Design a protein around this ligand. Structure first.
Ligand SMILES: NC(=O)c1ccc[n+]([C@@H]2O[C@H](COP(=O)([O-])OP(=O)(O)OC[C@H]3O[C@@H](n4cnc5c(N)ncnc54)[C@H](OP(=O)(O)O)[C@@H]3O)[C@@H](O)[C@H]2O)c1
Ligand SMILES: CCCc1n[nH]c2c1[C@@H](c1cc(OC)c(O)c([N+](=O)[O-])c1)C(C#N)=C(N)O2
Length: 318
């Protein structure tokens, strides 16, 4: 149920995603994470950006308190947001998360996104023309600060998210590198299966972690409502009928059998319990091939508002 990372730690291959649109009350993140743990999830993914780490920490700690799990049974991910890329601000950011969580460490700390924005409480700072106030930071300097967090034991493992191949290489080949990223958390699903980035990551011992595995939240305005609905896919639904599972479970199983760690968000009890069933069955080679055919090379999450700066990751082929 776990993959071994390049720093020797272990990551459960199924993970619970906690992000939800703003309209959703924070109390739901607490209830949802509790249900997820009760249903079998041991890998919990969140972020400072999501503004729920207080709720997600409470859910984790309450499931420790009622004796369901030990801390060591739980793999919790946080992420450093773009308003704290500056080296001197990395640790205060992790420490703030730990304070909100009331946890002693995170199992995994990621650089959330490679484009930096102006330091401050605002997570998307803008000027009067509604333009983003970008910052200028050497992400290599950021990584060194992130490395010290592992030295200090605040994060057991460290990694990145939304990095392209060249940005991975920038870190990987950096003079005096202490720790490789253990993972690259990126968008991955049958419509955008990241084969080249996946091959690159494997070659360097980096785990690929798939977010928006089910076709994403589809939150407006962030995502075009005209974009294909992954869970309504002909092939996934046919595989679903054939295996007496669901399209969601097919999409999740696909990532597992191709060596990808896979995230899945849900605030619904039934689907939360459904999603852990990913372990109950397997696809054949021929089905895996057929899912491979689904690739459309189109992202649900482009973050156009962050395009412009030299670190915008999605302009390279991969
Ligand atoms: N840049 C980043 O690092 C980044 C970006 C995006 C996401 N993420 C992470 O990845 C997580 C998940 O990605 P995501 O939120 O974009 O979406 P997702 O996991 O691909 O899908 C979420 C949507 O699918 C629905 N759903 C869940 N299980 C289902 C099932 N069994 N059958 C049918 N529908 C189902 C959910 O509805 P219900 O809640 O009603 O069940 C929700 O609307 C996030 O929470 C976050 O942790 C990270
Ligand atoms: C910079 C904009 C931040 C932001 N605030 N609210 C958002 C975002 C976008 C986002 C960015 C993420 O990492 C960069 C991320 O981790 C996740 N996630 O977890 O779903 C979502 C987004 C999209 N698409 C949607 N629908 O809502």
């Amino acid at each position: 149920q776990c993959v071994k990372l390049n720093d020797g730690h272990f990551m459960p291959v199924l993970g619970f995603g906690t992000y939800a649109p703003a309209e959703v009350p924070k109390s739901k993140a607490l209830e949802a994470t509790k249900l997820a743990i009760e249903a079998g999830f041991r890998h919990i993914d969140s972020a400072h950006l999501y503004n729920n780490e207080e709720q997600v920490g409470l859910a984790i700690r309450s499931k420790i308190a009622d004796g369901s799990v030990k801390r060591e049974d739980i793999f919790y991910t946080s992420k450093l947001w773009c308003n704290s890329h500056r080296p001197e601000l990395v640790r205060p950011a992790l420490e703030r998360s730990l304070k909100n969580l009331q946890l002693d460490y995170v199992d995994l700390y990621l650089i959330h996104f490679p484009v930096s924005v102006k330091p401050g409480e605002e997570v998307i700072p803008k000027d009067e023309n509604g333009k983003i106030l970008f910052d200028t930071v050497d992400l290599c300097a950021t990584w060194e600060a992130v490395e010290k967090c592992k030295d200090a034991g605040l994060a057991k493992s460290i990694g990145v998210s939304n990095f392209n191949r060249r940005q991975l290489e920038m870190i990987l080949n950096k003079p005096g590198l202490k720790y490789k990223p253990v993972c690259n958390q990126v968008e991955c699903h049958p419509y955008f299966n990241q084969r080249k980035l996946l091959d690159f990551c494997k070659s360097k011992d980096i785990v690929l972690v798939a977010y928006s595995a089910l076709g994403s939240h589809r939150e407006e305005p962030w995502v075009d409502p005209n974009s294909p609905v992954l869970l309504e896919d002909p092939v996934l639904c046919a595989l679903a009928k054939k295996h007496k599972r669901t399209p969601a479970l097919i999409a999740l199983r696909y990532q597992l059998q191709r060596g990808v760690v896979v995230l899945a968000k849900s605030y619904n009890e039934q689907r939360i319990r459904q999603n852990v069933q990913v372990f109950e069955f397997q696809l054949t080679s021929e089905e895996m091939k057929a899912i491979d055919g689904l690739n459309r090379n189109v992202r649900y999450l482009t973050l156009d508002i962050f395009a412009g700066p030299p670190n915008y990751p999605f302009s390279d082929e991969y």
